[PDB]
Amino acid sequence: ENGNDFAALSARNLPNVSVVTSDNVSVLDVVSANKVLATQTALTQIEEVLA
Amino acid sequence: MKLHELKPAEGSRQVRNRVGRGTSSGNGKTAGRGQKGQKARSGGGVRLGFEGGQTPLFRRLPKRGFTNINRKDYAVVNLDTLNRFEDGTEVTPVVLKEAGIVKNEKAGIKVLADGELTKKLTVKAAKFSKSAQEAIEAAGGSIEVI
Amino acid sequence: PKQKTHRGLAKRVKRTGGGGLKRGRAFTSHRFHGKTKKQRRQLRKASMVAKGDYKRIRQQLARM
RNA sequence: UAUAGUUGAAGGAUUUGGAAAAUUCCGCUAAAGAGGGUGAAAGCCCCGUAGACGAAAUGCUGACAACACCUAGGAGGAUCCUGAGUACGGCGGAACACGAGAAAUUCCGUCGGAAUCCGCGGGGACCAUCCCGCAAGGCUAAAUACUCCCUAGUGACCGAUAGUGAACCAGUACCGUGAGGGAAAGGUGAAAAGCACCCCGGAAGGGGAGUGAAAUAGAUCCUGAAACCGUGUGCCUACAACAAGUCAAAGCUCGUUAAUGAGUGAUGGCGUGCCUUUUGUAGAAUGAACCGGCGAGUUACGAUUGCAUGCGAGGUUAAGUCGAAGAGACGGAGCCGCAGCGAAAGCGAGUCUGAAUAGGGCGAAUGAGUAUGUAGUCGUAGACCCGAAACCAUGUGAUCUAC
RNA sequence: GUAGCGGAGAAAUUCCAAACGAACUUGGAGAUAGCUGGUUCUCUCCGAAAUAGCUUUAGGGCUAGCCUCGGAAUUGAGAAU
RNA sequence: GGUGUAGUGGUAGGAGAGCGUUCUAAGGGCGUUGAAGGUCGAUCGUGAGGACGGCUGGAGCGCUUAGAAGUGAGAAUGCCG
RNA sequence: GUGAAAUUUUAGUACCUGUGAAGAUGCAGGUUACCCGCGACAGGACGGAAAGACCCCAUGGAGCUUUACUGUAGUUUGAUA
């Protein structure tokens, strides 16, 4: 979502994992991954900007 | 779509033609230029419109007219476009804009009668042709040059 | 850079509604005692540009 | 804050090797899986990295203090002030996109030469009226241009004929009186363990013996192609006129990615290289000694057509702001299309010519566009590559030769 | 001592560093050349011209004619007897 | 897919469809039990071209799909060796 | 004993009469001829060396002439400071 900084730190450095915030998703980020793990808050925030 | 199986749409990308790469391709050895002459040289050719030495066509013809410095051009809208408003609306240059019908109203709007209205408008604009005003007033509305 | 239009052609020609080019006529400034009244009556009407001339002229008038 | 630094998590056995970081088992660590080194390819071996900490001294940038400077209203309209050889004009030149033009505006040389608020200049010759300003005195941050140099990095940029002229002691050797011109030349091995001792030989060089995983890795040292020069052999050849092969074929010699096998070949038929330029070439027309490397339609910005995708009587944003040199939203100034005709005034599904409502010209009558990608052609740029004789502008030469 | 838009010449277009009807070097500069040379892989389908007119034009160019690719259109418009 | 009928010389030149080189991304692989490169063979495809095996060699390299190009050499009285 | 050069498409490189871009070692029909060298001569290889200096062209240059065009340094004559 947002200043969820402890989670982004914990998820760095894992060689299968990429981390993006909900105001900064590109087309190339979603196509390259096999799955998306999004939180409930971030999902509504994406629905707010793609409208 | 996966990044290891991309495919453009058919007919959308073409390859390229490379001249001077052997005889069997079709364009080796002079690369489509024929034999000798001014057109076979690098940077060869004559300027656009040149004709050898015959008098070029622009130079046998006479000049004509002048530009007026106070010229007025308007931004016509005919009569069908006034059918996308409700019966009774007072159409105007700001309601025409903000529907995008007219952007860039050059020297003001001018209404033209081509060809059929059925509404109850009250049109405000800068000019009216004789039949535009007429058909506007038959259908039952009013005009005002302003 | 941008393409430049031929300024001598633009002073002599205009573009009609279906894409053509209206033009004036030659032999219309000078010795009219050498030509017949029917000639000078019929050299007063405008005409258009031919296809050989247009093919070679098209790019110089692209913008006006 | 710049200029030194400090600390910084987590692995052992097994197989193949000279040597593991590789393979197979079983573990651990991460706010650190960026990168470099180590006898081959390492998150966990070394240097680092993420994170936390630090400056005696000198230099920079803020903030707040002092000290220095600068800055007031209302009324009156008797009189005084407000940039002079100046503005401006004739003559000659130039600058304005504007080539004297109908030539306003701004400069330079030369001559002539104002007015003072009842004034003076401008609105593209000139005049009248209205409107906007107040020359002939001085200074001023930022938003814009550039990189010899220092720090930290980046690249669908080069990899020793490339990339700087220069990866190496290069503006060097070398060439010229001089100004000036100007190169060639990287690689043993993990570690020098770089061959003790013996034999032939003046030496060079070589043969053993040793080092080493390997010396046919021995310093002309990784790999080691072709031209070119040799040694050994299976088959042919001393009565034969040969662009040198191709088709037919006995004898001899072999035995393969195993199939209608491979090498050589006496003898017989047929047969005037390759490239360029030409009406036309074996040409006694043109080029090439041979082998290897290098060596020629590209990009930027515009214009047009075909194909493709998204929207559709509509389509689309530019500069710029935040953002990782990115995507990823704001931004509607502007551009194209949706209506034409006419030199223009103008009129408008019609309009111009015309006395004409006549005729005719060009238009309408459902009649599709716009942004972006891609390819074909064209324009401006050296514009597919190489090649003159010449022209101009700075400089260096009378150590040769002429007076 | 005299230097290249120049010098010097008992005069020859003679000399000015083995080259002088106008020295040498660097720059404008990748000067210009309607001329000459060269231009690098493959297969499938089609397939010309060497003519007319105008040209300070004649070994260059332009428009038409003759080749190739994509579309549209009523036909029974093309050819041979 | 069957079957018929018709066609398939070609310079300038137009149109179509492919082979090979280097680099980027994503995926799935190989390698000291020996990669690239070099050399030999009597192998495969309609062409450019593709494999497999021996010997040499000592550390990197293929394949698929898409992208980008300093992308192919026998000739210039070419340039260097 | 030492040790170059210009040249060079590859060469197992005869003669006569013809043919042919119209004068052939190489093409046709004949005639002649065992293999490999050394010392000598210059008939041929349109022999080698020098992208004809002769001739014409490039809407190429450069030096020179003049009552060819357009300018100008210098000299002179008037007005004005």
TrEMBL record, chain A:
What's a single GO CC term here? ribonucleoprotein complex
Keywords linked to the UniProt accession: Ribonucleoprotein, Ribosomal protein, RNA-binding, rRNA-binding
Q: Name one GO molecular function term.
A: structural constituent of ribosome
Q: Does the keyword Ribosomal protein apply?
A: yes
GO biological process annotation, one example: translation
Secretion signal, residue range per the UniProt entry: none
What function is annotated for this protein? One of the primary rRNA binding proteins, this protein initially binds near the 5'-end of the 23S rRNA. It is important during the early stages of 50S assembly. It makes multiple contacts with different domains of the 23S rRNA in the assembled 50S subunit and ribosome.
Q: How does it assemble?
A: Part of the 50S ribosomal subunit.
**Which family would the database say this protein is a member of?**
Belongs to the universal ribosomal protein uL4 family.
**Protein name (Swiss-Prot/TrEMBL):** Large ribosomal subunit protein uL4
Coverage span on the entire protein:
157 to 207 of 207
From TrEMBL, chain B:
Ranges of compositional bias, category Gly residues: 23-35, 42-51
Question: Any keyword Ion transport?
Answer: no
One GO process term, biological-process aspect: translation
The identity of this protein, by name, is: Large ribosomal subunit protein uL15
Q: Where is this region: Disordered?
A: 1-51
What the protein does comes down to: Binds to the 23S rRNA.
Q: Might you report a single GO cellular component term?
A: cytosolic large ribosomal subunit
Q: How does it assemble?
A: Part of the 50S ribosomal subunit.
What GO molecular function terms would the record report? rRNA binding; structural constituent of ribosome
The record's listing under InterPro entries reads: Ribosomal_uL15, Ribosomal_uL15/eL18, Ribosomal_uL15/eL18_sf, Ribosomal_uL15_bac-type, Ribosomal_uL15_CS
Q: Which UniProt keywords apply?
A: Metal-binding, Ribonucleoprotein, Ribosomal protein, RNA-binding, rRNA-binding
So which domain of life are we looking at? Bacteria
Q: Which residues form the Large ribosomal subunit protein uL15/eL18 domain?
A: 76-144
Q: Where is this chain compositionally biased, Basic and acidic residues type?
A: 1-10
Which family is annotated? Belongs to the universal ribosomal protein uL15 family.
Binding sites annotated in the UniProt record for Mg(2+): K29
TrEMBL record, chain C:
Indicate whether Chaperone appears among the record's keywords: no
Protein keywords: Ribonucleoprotein, Ribosomal protein
Species this chain originates from: Enterococcus faecalis
Q: What InterPro entries does its record include? A: Ribosomal_bL35, Ribosomal_bL35-like, Ribosomal_bL35_CS, Ribosomal_bL35_sf
Name the GO terms of the biological process aspect: translation
Basic residues bias spans: 1-15, 22-44
Under the heading PANTHER family, the entry gives:
54S RIBOSOMAL PROTEIN BL35M (PTHR33343), LARGE RIBOSOMAL SUBUNIT PROTEIN BL35M (PTHR33343:SF1)
For this chain, the family text in UniProt reads:
Belongs to the bacterial ribosomal protein bL35 family.
> What HAMAP family has UniProt attached to this entry?
Ribosomal_bL35 (MF_00514)
Please name the GO terms that the record assigns under molecular function: structural constituent of ribosome
Spell out the residue ranges making up region: Disordered: 1-52
Look up the record and report any one GO term of the cellular component aspect. cytosolic large ribosomal subunit
According to the record, the signal peptide region is: none
Q: What name appears for this protein in its UniProt entry? A: Large ribosomal subunit protein bL35
